[PDB]
Amino acid sequence: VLGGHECQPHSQPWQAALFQGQQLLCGGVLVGGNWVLTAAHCKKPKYTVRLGDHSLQNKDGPEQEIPVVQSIPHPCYNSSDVEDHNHDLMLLQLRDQASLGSKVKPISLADHCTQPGQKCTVSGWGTVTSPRENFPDTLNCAEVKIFPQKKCEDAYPGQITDGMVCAGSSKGADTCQGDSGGPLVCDGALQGITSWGSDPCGRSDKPGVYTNICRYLDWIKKIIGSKG
Ligand SMILES: [Ca+2]
């Protein structure tokens, strides 16, 4: 997270993280008790979701390390075409139900699509600098603004679909490598999932690109609304 700051600890109780061992893979969002939403390009055969975390190295005390027993990418997501990022979404089913409270808790899915100029929040453990990477130990937060789609399209010509949403900052706040799969929160709801962006991060002319969650409501709800 460029141009941001260290989040107040556990102020994003929905924040998740994908670990393989001690190696941090991606961010994630807790949208249900046993359900974690992330980016499809983070798919791995085996990994563990960590919740209630702030410092990667240090014990904060909320941490819950829960393995995932099912990975469900979006059926129209394509790993073949690189740079076709459309439908970058995956739901991870947790073996165990998460223990919930002020420190850990699912976030409501946004039932509205957003509007340009909407101020939002991104969080993650991804690099705080770019191009020279610095991966912080503590979760970082930044405020961003929803870009109009046609500015988004012109920023990445031909690469933007209606399942994507652009969010950027004049002062350089942007998601970066290691934040993928993490939350985009607008008005206390989950508006998006960190998908991809430009090189370097935090370019005034290039906003971050997030999977537009208002478009996927019926697919997420169906899977997480099942008997699983
Ligand atoms: Ca910790």
Distance 62 CA to ligand 1 centre (A): 8
Dist. CA 99–CA 65, nearest whole Å:
11
DSSP secondary structure code for residue 45 in this structure: S
What is the distance in A from the centroid of ligand 1 to the CA of 138?
Answer: 8
Co-location of 203 and 134 in the same domain? yes
Please report how many Cα atoms fall inside a 13 Å half-sphere around the Cα of residue 188, on the Cβ side. 1
Strands 164-168 and 189-196: unpaired
| DSSP calls for 144-204 | EEEPPHHHHHHHSTTT--TTEEEEE-TT--B--TT-TT-EEEETTEEEEEEEE--SSSS-S
> Is residue 8 domain-shared with residue 115, that is, in the same domain?
yes
Q: Are 205 and 139 in a shared domain?
A: yes
Angle, CA 30 vertex, CA 140 and CA 180 arms, to 5°: 50
Per DSSP, the three-state class of 16 is: strand
204 and 153 assigned to the same domain? yes
- Other beta carbons within 10 angstroms of residue 98's beta carbon come to 21
Method: X-ray
CA of 156 to the centre of ligand 1 (A): 37
For CA atoms 182, 186, 192, 196, the dihedral sign is negative
* 71/150 same-domain check: no
The 10 Å Cβ neighbour count of residue 74 is 20
Question: Ligand 1 is a single-atom ion; what residues have CB below 5 A from it?
Answer: 53, 55, 60
How far is ligand 1, taken at its centre, from the CA of residue 88, in Å?
A: 28
Instruction: Note whether 40 and 123 are same-domain residues.
Output: no
Same domain, 100 and 137: no
Which residues are paired to 29 by β-bridges? Answer: 15, 37
Kindly give the distance from the C-alpha atom of residue 7 to the centroid of ligand 1, in angstroms, as a whole number: 13
- Give distance in angstroms: CA of 135 to centre of ligand 1: 15
Let me know: does 79 contact 90? Beta carbons within 8 Å: no
Query: What is the rounded distance in angstroms from the CA atom of residue 2 to the CA atom of residue 130?
Result: 8
What CA–CA distance (Å, rounded) separates 208 from 175?
A: 6
Considering Cα of 99, then 100, then 105, then 109, what sign does the dihedral take?
A: positive
**Structure tokens of 197?**
């962006």
- Judge if 7 and 18 occupy the same domain: no
Catalytic hit among 10, 41, 54, 74: 41
- Integer distance in angstroms from the first to the last C-alpha of the chain? 33
CB 186 within 8 A of CB 110: yes
Q: What's the resolution in A?
A: 2.3
CA gap 46, 70 in Å, rounded: 9
Is 71 a known active-site residue?
Answer: no
Task: Identify the CATH number of the domain in which residue 85 sits.
Answer: 2.40.10.10
Q: How far is the CA of 96 from the centre of ligand 1 (A)?
A: 19
| In contact, 76 and 95? CB cutoff 8 Å | no
Look up the domain containing 79 and give its range.
Answer: 13-106+215-224
Clarify whether 218 is annotated catalytic: no
Q: What is d(CA 55, CA 80) in angstroms, rounded to the nearest whole number?
A: 35
Active-site annotation holds for 180:
yes
Angle at 189 between CA 226 and CA 88, to 5 degrees: 65
Burial class (CB in 10 A: 0-12, 13-18, 19+), 199: exposed
CA distance 104 to 107: 10
Q: What is the number of structural domains in the chain?
A: 2
Active-site option among 71, 169, 180, 198 = 180
CA-to-CA separations, 52 to 71, 174, 216, in angstroms, rounded: 21, 23, 26
Which of 88, 130, 174, 195 is catalytic? The answer is 88
Q: Are residues 96 and 111 in the same domain?
A: no
Place of tokens 């260290």: 6
The contacts found for 213-216 with CB under 8 angstroms, 24 or more apart, are 213/109, 213/110, 213/184, 214/110, 214/111, 214/112, 214/113, 214/114, 215/113, 215/162, 215/163, 216/74, 216/89, 216/163
> Are 20 and 47 contacting, i.e. CB atoms less than 8 angstroms apart?
yes
